[PDB]
Design a protein around this ligand. Structure first.
Ligand SMILES: C[C@@](O)(CCOP(=O)(O)O)CC(=O)O
Ligand SMILES: C[C@@](O)(CCOP(=O)(O)O)CC(=O)O
Ligand code: F3S
Ligand code: F3S
Lengths: 386, 131, 386, 131
């Protein structure tokens, strides 16, 4: 990878240890993957925030930067924190303060594009959080690799990322066609479609046919699920995503998704209500329409839930929910909007044994952690819950 | 023995016993950073330790925070001696880089089987099976 | 225009006066413009909110709907309110309550796409507010006509809009090429570029060449200015907007914008500081990066302004500014973030005589209202102000 | 006299004196709803009243709230008797529709001049100049 004279000086340490540590990560990556140069990025999104995920070793890694006075040189937003007991939260506050000290916007949400950091079509950025990578590449047509937490941080500090991978036109072409014969209409339908496709494909850029989502949040969930059971960073949907019309430049194979594929996932996430002690909506963090939907479903139920419902969402969405009166409605029925946080990355083993959700990403992770899981559309969960 | 030629991800040299999985792996969720024991309930090597071994798997999946799990494994001295993958994406590469774990990709991993002794010349991207 | 049996019954009054009144507006429009049918819309954005703009006649028009129990049948957001004395605000609250009663999200912002209502590429919607029309068509590649306030409301109630105009592929093609030879780099550069182009073109879909904006907010302002001095609802920018690659399907004329064109606009908005008694940023409503920029400029100035600075912004952005600490910083230096409101649509004649701003849309309207106007980039305004 | 054939926007029939502008017009900012007096500081007919006249202009510009200004003009009985434009966009059409102001577009407005007497047959889109 070519470096400018200024970048060579940064690598050499002429501008201090913090920039040099970040540059060393970016140079290693660009050299591995054959990047011609570093390109500037318009923003970063940094994952690796919950103390459960990064531990004391993660705190040490960040303190190494912070003690050298590290500061991000581009606009940078931040993924959500975990929730836990007093000892956990003390550690969790330590992490957030380390990120704050580097000049990052402590937004604590996996949906920064809801008011904090919205990439434009064609923008080169360096984002981790796999569902936000998928959203930015696929739904908005921005350009980012599936960054590791630390490589997004390194890019934020240098203000540049290596020019390889999804930054290049040729790596944004479809590699396979997915013909969705299955009936896919609801949020939870898209959850299990993404669950299936992520683990069926490899490192692919799928082109979806016969898929007409009513709501953007359906594609948000599709990308989130495929980035959990698989490694999908970019996909195309015919008529629905901005890069679809030049996505196919080769003769490609077609896989088809049938009802039987989706039934299999649904039937494996159907633990009994007697094993569920919370409902979780908002993985990735809920949009304001998602919050509105739940307020309406709770008022139609007309009696409070006897297990708690939690809606994880961005600060922006939480504030809109407060201002428009949805928060008060939802709390009337034993629901709560939890800003800034994520339950999947929280050590809640001893607090909850079973989670009902409409999110395929949450269902996948909670199952792999040993929880009971019921996956269903939120209207069914709210109607049937105790 | 036979040589498999691939791509350097992180340099270094290592020799040891191979432990092979045929399923994509997410270190966040798939490996306990405290122990090095695979914790994926659907891994074909669930319950086995990767610490001090040569870990083979086809490709990563899942969380972009996997890089931090790899780093925590290394700091707990429970990380593999080296890692051989079919294709290494940014998340996995980044974990190896910050953890200084020798790593190669582009290897035909179907030719590796559990229990083999191997030399990994990560600087040159080469894996040698020891007979 | 073809109507389904259900739509014919609505037109006939079978489902009540409110739906029939809305349908009559949509049928008249579709018949004028040769629409084949009504198509469903995924959302609406409704302008005509400030009491100064709509008056008692506007209140009567809305009450006609509300007294018949009108309710929007799709997700609908709302443009900003005005600010004034006690009598004005009583009337202003009346308007907002009328919209609230129709089930509209009273978001009170011209930038609903910052967390409340983000259209997806290809989505058919019915939006008024000319800068948001421009944003949704041009930057996101959604599809909406330049709706009048009342036609967006009618569409929100029926949940459909007539299929003509910018909903059709053929009307999204470029009609003219704009070669920007002028140096255009800053926010205020884009303000005057849009001011000039809007009044130079007619009903056009311009394709911009040699224009590489560093920030999305630069294009937000470009579309806002062209929708004020002109009628531009959709434009393309080479490499930067999602529909650019198939925008040119004919041989087109090229106009060029030179430095002399932009100097002329700049030089006409340079009233003396002694005539200015407020600074206004956030037309259209400020993004969180815009708020961040101002906090940084005020801290570098290091002393309070002696005239007030106002930043109009969405509730979402205001809440992020509160949570991230920018509100406190800005208030230290005689700045304020004003949510839910717009100064251009406020009766502030007797409160302020002169407005300094970086917005070409604000500069145009305040000039036409008789105010003194100084147009400049916000860094220069903050450095030079008393 | 000579007939100019265009497109019906809002039906009705009217006859009166023409007042012509050659610049695009935004009713929000360009016309005072209380008086019917043009208030655009750069209009070629600034200061003149449109109330009760036949207003000619090439096309709208500016605010999507212009439809509400047209409606307020009509409710204050200060609106033109009819409007003739070169091209009528959604905002202007919508104002005429809710205000029941006869309106046509698609007319060669360069052939109309201030002070002419005209019949507008808006139902058929036709303008007739009266000699
Ligand atoms: C699994 C994942 O959602 C974990 C996020 O953890 P954190 O909030 O960034 O600490 C990250 C991803 O999917 O890339
Ligand atoms: C001029 C304009 O910004 C006025 C908006 O007024 P209101 O807040 O929707 O009442 C509308 C537009 O430009 O379309
Ligand atoms: S970070 Fe967000 S995408 Fe899901 S796993 Fe947590 S709510
Ligand atoms: S509505 Fe918004 S676009 Fe400007 S004129 Fe008012 S701040």
């Amino acid at each position: 990878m070519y470096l400018t004279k200024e970048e060579e000086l940064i690598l050499a340490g002429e501008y201090g240890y913090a920039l040099q540590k970040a540059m060393e990560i970016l140079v290693a990556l660009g050299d591995i993957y054959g990047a011609d140069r570093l390109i500037p990025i318009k923003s970063a999104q940094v994952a690796g925030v919950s103390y459960k995920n990064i531990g004391d070793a993660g705190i040490e890694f960040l303190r190494d930067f912070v003690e050298a006075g590290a500061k991000v040189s581009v606009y940078t937003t931040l993924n959500p924190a975990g929730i836990g007991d007093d000892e956990f939260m003390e550690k969790q506050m330590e992490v957030l303060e380390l990120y704050r000290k580097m000049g990052i916007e402590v937004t604590s949400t996996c949906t920064p594009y809801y008011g904090a950091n919205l990439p434009k079509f064609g923008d080169h950025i360096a984002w981790s959080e796999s569902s936000a990578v998928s959203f930015a590449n696929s739904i908005l047509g921005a350009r980012t690799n599936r960054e590791g937490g630390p490589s997004s941080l390194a890019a934020a500090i240098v203000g540049k990322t290596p020019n390889y991978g999804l930054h290049l036109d040729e790596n944004r072409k479809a590699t396979v066609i997915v013909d969705v014969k299955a009936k896919v209409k609801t949020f939870a339908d898209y959850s299990v479609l993404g669950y299936h496709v992520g683990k069926t494909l490899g490192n692919d850029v799928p082109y979806f046919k016969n898929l007409k989502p009513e709501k953007t949040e359906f594609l948000k969930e599709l990308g989130a699920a495929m980035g959990a059971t698989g490694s999908i960073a970019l996909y195309h949907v015919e008529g629905e995503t901005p890069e679809y019309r030049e996505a196919i430049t080769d003769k490609l194979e077609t896989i088809t998704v049938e009802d039987s594929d989706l039934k299999a996932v649904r039937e494996s996430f159907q633990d009994d209500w007697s094993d569920i002690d919370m409902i979780l909506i908002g993985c990735p963090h809920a949009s304001l329409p998602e919050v509105k939907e739940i307020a309406e479903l709770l008022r139609m139920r007309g009696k409070p839930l006897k297990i708690p419902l939690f809606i994880t969402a961005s600060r922006a969405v939480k504030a809109l929910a407060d201002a428009l009166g949805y928060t008060e409605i939802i709390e009337r029925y034993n629901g709560k909007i939890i800003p800034d946080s994520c339950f999947v990355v929280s050590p809640i083993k001893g607090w909850y044994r079973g989670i009902a959700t409409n999110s395929g990403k949450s269902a996948f992770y909670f199952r792999s952690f040993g929880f009971s899981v019921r996956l269903d559309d939120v209207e069914n969960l709210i109607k049937e819950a105790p | 023995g036979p040589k498999l030629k691939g791509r350097k991800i992180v340099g270094g040299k290592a020799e040891g016993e191979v432990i092979v999985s045929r399923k994509p792996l997410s270190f966040l969720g798939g490996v306990d950073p405290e122990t090095g024991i695979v914790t994926d309930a659907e891994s074909d090597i669930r319950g086995q330790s990767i610490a001090g071994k040569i870990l083979v798997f086809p490709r990563g999946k899942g969380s972009t925070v996997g890089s931090y799990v790899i780093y925590a494994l290394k700091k707990n001295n429970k990380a593999p001696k080296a890692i051989i993958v079919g294709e290494a994406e940014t998340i996995v590469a980044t974990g190896a880089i910050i953890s200084d774990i020798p790593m190669v990709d582009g290897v035909d991993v179907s030719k590796l089987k559990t229990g083999m002794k191997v030399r990994v010349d990560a600087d040159s991207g080469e894996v040698e099976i020891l007979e």
